[PDB]
Amino acid sequence: CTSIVAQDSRGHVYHGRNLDYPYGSILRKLTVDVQFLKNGQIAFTGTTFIGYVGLWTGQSPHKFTVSGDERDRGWWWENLVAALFLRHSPISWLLRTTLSEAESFEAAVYRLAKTPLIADVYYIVGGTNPREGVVITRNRDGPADIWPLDPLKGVWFLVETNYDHWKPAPEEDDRRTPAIKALNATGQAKLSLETLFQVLSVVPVYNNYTIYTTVMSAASPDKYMTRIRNP
Amino acid sequence: PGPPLFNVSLDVAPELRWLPVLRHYDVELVRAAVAQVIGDRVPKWVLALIEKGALKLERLLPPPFTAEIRGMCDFLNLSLADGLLVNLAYEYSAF
Numbered sequence A: 001c002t003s004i005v006a007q008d009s010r011g012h013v014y015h016g017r018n019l020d021y022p023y024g025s026i027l028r029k030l031t032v033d034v035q036f037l038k039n040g041q042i043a044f045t046g047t048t049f050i051g052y053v054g055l056w057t058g059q060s061p062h063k064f065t066v067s068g069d070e071r072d073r074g075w076w077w078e079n080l081v082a083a084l085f086l087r088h089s090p091i092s093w094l095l096r097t098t099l100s101e102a103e104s105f106e107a108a109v110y111r112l113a114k115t116p117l118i119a120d121v122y123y124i125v126g127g128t129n130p131r132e133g134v135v136i137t138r139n140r141d142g143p144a145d146i147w148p149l150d151p152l153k154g155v156w157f158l159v160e161t162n163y164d165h166w167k168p169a170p171e172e173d174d175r176r177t178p179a180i181k182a183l184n185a186t187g188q189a190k191l192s193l194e195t196l197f198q199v200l201s202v203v204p205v206y207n208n209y210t211i212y213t214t215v216m217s218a219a220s221p222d223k224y225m226t227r228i229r230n231p
Numbered sequence B: 001p002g003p004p005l006f007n008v009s010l011d012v013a014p015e016l017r018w019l020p021v022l023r024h025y026d027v028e029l030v031r032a033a034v035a036q037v038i039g040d041r042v043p044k045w046v047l048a049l050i051e052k053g054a055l056k057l058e059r060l061l062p063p064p065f066t067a068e069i070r071g072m073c074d075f076l077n078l079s080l081a082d083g084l085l086v087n088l089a090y091e092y093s094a095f
């Protein structure tokens, strides 16, 4: 999977993501966008598969946008002890709980970072104001690292696949470089939802296992766009 | 166009809120689909261990997490163990 939060020259923040997973021929037919209503009014939007109640891609309108990528660390028995004996939270559920109860980008980044989990994950959050963008590397008991946007220092985009950003992506699976490569060339002046979609449409960022691509901006909720990918 | 768009009112009890969506889906496609994600990656005794202890396991998970799954599995006629196995699929193999 590949999550990208980036800022453009005019101060806007965009969030896009890819979701790769086997059994694609099935999940593509079951993929749906869902609008969760409170009192008849939309409270947040998400992309999920029929039968899955958690969210791996969501948007709280005019507050923030969050997505999740897999982080495989620890031992198999950690997830067991954490889930049953310690009663930690599932990843996809916390992501959904936050989209519904967090009152601000700051509040969401707090919940997604400090709430205990059953297993590790990468949480990517975007905001409605400039420089609001982070990549929360999660340990089970807390945050292992927070990676903030810094446009004035030249970092106007964060690219997260499934590996810690302070280390190089493995040779076997290095979808970070072609994603950075396409962003380095797109330019902070040309960045938009249309362009950010074409970034994620690059190979091998867009590979055989990609199921859907979502591009979203918390301050432009009506532009929430998901597209099923048939490679 | 993109994928279908549905509404899920959180003002409806957890077990009922997902059901208006399932009307649009073949109860067989969903159920048969699960067996392919399940049968090929988990032995039965695990599934039996879960099934036997599934009703005590769901006591631990968040109430609204399981309640929504329970309602879908009754409507679709799925085993609750199969339900909890796909929703905790990430947590089952992420280490």
Ligand SMILES: CC(C)(C)CC(C)(C)c1ccc(OCCOCCO)cc1
Binding pocket: B013, B015, B016, B019, B070, B071, B074, B075
């Ligand atoms: C009809 C089913 C089989 C689909 C679902 C089941 C039995 C689990 C069900 C059936 C009814 C039910 O009541 C919810 C209404 O409560 C409003 C305030 O609490 C909750 C669950």
Ligand SMILES: CC(C)(C)CC(C)(C)c1ccc(OCCOCCO)cc1
Binding pocket: A076, A077, A079, A080, A083, A084, A118, B050, B057, B084, B085, B088, B091, B092, B093
């Ligand atoms: C009950 C589950 C499996 C649905 C979820 C939890 C999180 C508790 C879980 C998740 C993972 C898990 O790992 C067991 C691997 O077995 C290897 C055998 O040598 C054990 C339990």
Ligand SMILES: *[C@@H]1O[C@H](CO)[C@@H](O)[C@H](O)[C@H]1NC(C)=O
Binding pocket: A035, A037, A040, B005, B006, B007
């Ligand atoms: C979801 O709810 C809104 C609330 O006004 C409604 O307008 C819309 O039609 C609903 N979505 C669908 C697909 O019916």
Ligand SMILES: *[C@@H]1O[C@H](CO)[C@@H](O)[C@H](O)[C@H]1NC(C)=O
Binding pocket: B077
């Ligand atoms: C529904 O589930 C019950 C209990 O497992 C079973 O006896 C029945 O044949 C099932 N019906 C369908 C249509 O799946």
Ligand SMILES: [Cl-]
Binding pocket: A096, A097, A100, B010
């Ligand atoms: Cl909720």
Ligand SMILES: [Cl-]
Binding pocket: A101, A102, A103, A104, A107
């Ligand atoms: Cl809050």
Ligand SMILES: [Cl-]
Binding pocket: A011, A130, A131, A151, A152
């Ligand atoms: Cl700025």
Ligand SMILES: [Cl-]
Binding pocket: A139, A140, A141
């Ligand atoms: Cl830990």
Ligand SMILES: [Cl-]
Binding pocket: A078, A082, A140, A141
């Ligand atoms: Cl731990």
Ligand SMILES: [Cl-]
Binding pocket: A159, A160, A161, A162, A163, A164, A165, A169, A176
């Ligand atoms: Cl990475």
Ligand SMILES: [Cl-]
Binding pocket: A227
């Ligand atoms: Cl398009």
Ligand SMILES: [Cl-]
Binding pocket: A228, A229, A230, A231
């Ligand atoms: Cl395509």
Ligand SMILES: [Cl-]
Binding pocket: B020
């Ligand atoms: Cl309807």
Ligand SMILES: [Cl-]
Binding pocket: B004, B024
């Ligand atoms: Cl459909």
Ligand SMILES: [Cl-]
Binding pocket: none
């Ligand atoms: Cl209809």
Ligand SMILES: [Cl-]
Binding pocket: B048, B049, B052
């Ligand atoms: Cl047994």
